[PDB]
């Protein structure tokens, strides 16, 4: 077996403790190379002639090349160290240690973790573990206020189709009106985009951390807000954009004003005084050049501090966490610091970052949460809308990014299928609502935090800004209420089944041929089986159920009953259905 395709480290995706005496390992290899992969370990100190202990690592999946094994080492004292024992197709064991690989045991080596120390155990916030949260819009969900309307705001109609220059009057108010019906979806949090004061339509860039902006509402509906929103347990996280701010930041349009006399001429990463020009850009932007958008010194601990202090500010408020606008861009230093502020102040705040590459560095437990999980919306928007990969690359996909990161990020995820910037998936669907309800199905069941977008619920479609971007619609007899009755039982049989909120997945059957796909979650002796059948076909499959673990199933959907023959489950699907098999534990 190719041993330099074999990999491990006592550390970040590899090595992370599930608590201050239980450690995690991950070892991954080639696909087929491996066989059994047992872990043998021992207190570190231990004495030379003593008896080490063992633990039989699990094929927890795998993706386009590799397999995956994991296996949990129980360390009584914090302190630990273990070698592999790998095995292949032949029955040829190897040991795998720091050292290399070799057939003796000792000549192995032995991987360690040193200590397992309890302040760095990656702790993430209860409520989050089972959300289901809104993506709201201000500007195009809900009109509550007509006076604190912009100028000309075109007509709130379902026959809109907005530019870049539209304007509704969104606000605050009636996201207040509307808190009945978020309630009577399911969600519990609103993730809302920027909403403090700034000049631009979008609010990306910051006029006044300190205050709402004036068309949505004020400190006092906000409260108000955040007040009603509770009562009814639904949260509020906030955009947060420390990576940059406007150009009327009051410190900046300061240095626009005095210049180097400015005290606040390094809060920014200007070139030279002037500053600002029409488009020619005097300092650095958050993008290519983009004017309006002056990047903020992070590392320079006033510009820290005062953000730090728009962090306390908001939360007093009663907010419950931040959403971390281009976080890929801010010294580490400043997001570490960010927790142990947010946190003290608030255990139970969420840190959700925005990264758009591997966000392994900040999911050590020690900076975000989770982030955006922009892996699963490809996987989903490919397999599902363009039909451009089958359900064994499907498989693929969500395998390997599944092994991304430590089980407390990756159980955190926020599963988006769109948002401002895209267009609406019901589009990327083509029309074909069989498609889309089979994608949501799997959304509100696959592991990670399902994060709807405003309108989805009830059928909006759309183009990319601005077009994705229409006013929701409210006229009772313009909603696909079909749509939304659908989303409410999968949003409360999500609630239910304690295995589809903090169980595990693992691929059960894949058909590349057939396009049907399905996982199974497991919290502790609940088995719960999503089988998707995506194909404009009715098909027939038999999935392997070892009748061992359950042998009658179930459809949490249709409340249909099933059971499975000679631990061989028989199955048939209309088109594009998809079953949720319950196995009663
Ligand atoms: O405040 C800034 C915004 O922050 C937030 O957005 C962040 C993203 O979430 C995050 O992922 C990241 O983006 C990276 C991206 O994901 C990477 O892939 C890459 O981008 C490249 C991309 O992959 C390539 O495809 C290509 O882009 C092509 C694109 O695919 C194609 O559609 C087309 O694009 C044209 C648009 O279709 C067209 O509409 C227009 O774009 C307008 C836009 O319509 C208009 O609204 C305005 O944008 C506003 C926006 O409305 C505000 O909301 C705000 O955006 C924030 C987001 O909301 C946050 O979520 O501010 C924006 C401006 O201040 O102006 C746009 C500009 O005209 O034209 C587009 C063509 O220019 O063609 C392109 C071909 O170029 O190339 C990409 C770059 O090479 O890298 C991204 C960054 O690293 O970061 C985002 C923040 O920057
Ligand atoms: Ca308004």
């Known amino acids: 077996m190719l041993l330099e395709a074999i990999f491990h480290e006592a550390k970040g995706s590899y090595a992370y403790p599930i608590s201050e005496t239980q450690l995690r390992v991950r070892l991954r290899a080639k696909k087929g190379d491996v066989v059994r992969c047992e872990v043998l370990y021992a207190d570190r100190y231990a004495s030379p002639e003593e008896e080490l202990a063992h633990a039989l690592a699990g094929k927890a999946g795998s993706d386009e090349r590799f397999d995956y094994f994991e296996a949990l080492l129980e360390c009584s004292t914090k302190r630990v160290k273990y070698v592999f024992l790998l095995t292949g197709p032949q029955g040829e064991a190897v040991y795998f240690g720091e050292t290399g690989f070799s057939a003796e045991r000792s000549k192995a080596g032995v991987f360690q973790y040193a200590y397992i120390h309890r302040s760095e155990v990656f702790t993430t916030p209860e409520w989050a573990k089972e959300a289901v949260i809104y993506q709201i819009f201000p500007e195009r969900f809900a009109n509550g206020d007509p006076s604190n309307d912009p100028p000309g705001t075109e007509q709130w109609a379902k026959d809109a189709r907005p530019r870049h220059d539209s304007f ?16 009577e979806l399911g969600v519990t949090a609103l993730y809302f985009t920027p909403i403090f004061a700034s000049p631009s339509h979008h609010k990306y860039d910051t006029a006044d951390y300190l205050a709402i902006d004036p068309q949505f509402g004020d400190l006092p509906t906000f409260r108000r807000l955040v007040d009603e929103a509770h009562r009814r347990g639904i949260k509020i996280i906030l955009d947060a954009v420390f990576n940059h701010a406007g150009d009327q930041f009051f410190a900046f349009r300061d240095v626009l004003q005095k210049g180097e006399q400015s005290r606040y001429k390094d809060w920014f990463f200007i070139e030279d005084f002037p500053v600002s020009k029409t488009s020619r850009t005097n300092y650095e932007t958050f993008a290519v050049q983009v004017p309006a958008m002056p990047k903020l010194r992070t590392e320079n601990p006033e510009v820290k501090e005062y953000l730090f202090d728009v962090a306390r500010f908001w939360m007093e408020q009663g907010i419950d966490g931040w959403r971390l606008n281009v976080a890929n861009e801010v010294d580490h230093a400043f997001w570490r610091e960010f927790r142990r502020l947010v946190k003290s102040l608030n255990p139970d705040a969420l840190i959700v970052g925005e990264i758009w ?16 999980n922009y892996l699963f919306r490809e996987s989903v928007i490919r397999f599902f809308a363009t ?45 074909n609502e069989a498609k889309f309800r089979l994608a949501v199905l799997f959304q509100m069941t696959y592991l990670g935090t399902p994060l709807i977008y405003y309108g989805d619920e009830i059928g909006m479609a759309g183009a990319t800004d601005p077009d994705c971007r229409r006013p929701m619609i ?8 079909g749509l939304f009755e659908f989303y409410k039982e999968l949003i409360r049989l999500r609630h239910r089944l304690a295995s589809l909120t903090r169980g595990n997945v693992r691929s059960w059957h894949a058909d590349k041929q057939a396009n049907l796909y399905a996982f199974v979650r497991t919290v502790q002796d609940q088995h719960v089986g999503v089988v998707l059948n995506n194909r404009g076909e009715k098909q027939t499959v038999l999935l392997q159920v070892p009748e061992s673990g359950g042998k009658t199933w179930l459809d949490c959907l249709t409340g249909e009953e099933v059971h499975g023959k000679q631990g061989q489950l028989k199955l048939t699907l209309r088109p594009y259905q998809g079953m949720i098999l319950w196995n009663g534990r």
């Open 168 to 183: 509704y009057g969104g606000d605050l108010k009636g996201v207040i009106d509307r808190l009945p019906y978020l309630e």
């Open 357 to 372: 590459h591997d966000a392994s560095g900040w999911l050590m437990g020690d900076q975000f949460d989770s982030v955006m």
């Open 387 to 431: 039909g451009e990969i089958h359900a064994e690359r499907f498989d693929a996909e969500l395998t390997r990014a599944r092994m991304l990161y430590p089980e407390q990020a990756a159980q955190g995820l926020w599963n988006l299928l769109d948002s401002h910037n895209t267009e609406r998936f019901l589009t990327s669907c083509g029309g």
């Open 474 to 481: 409210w006229e009772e007899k313009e909603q696909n209420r």
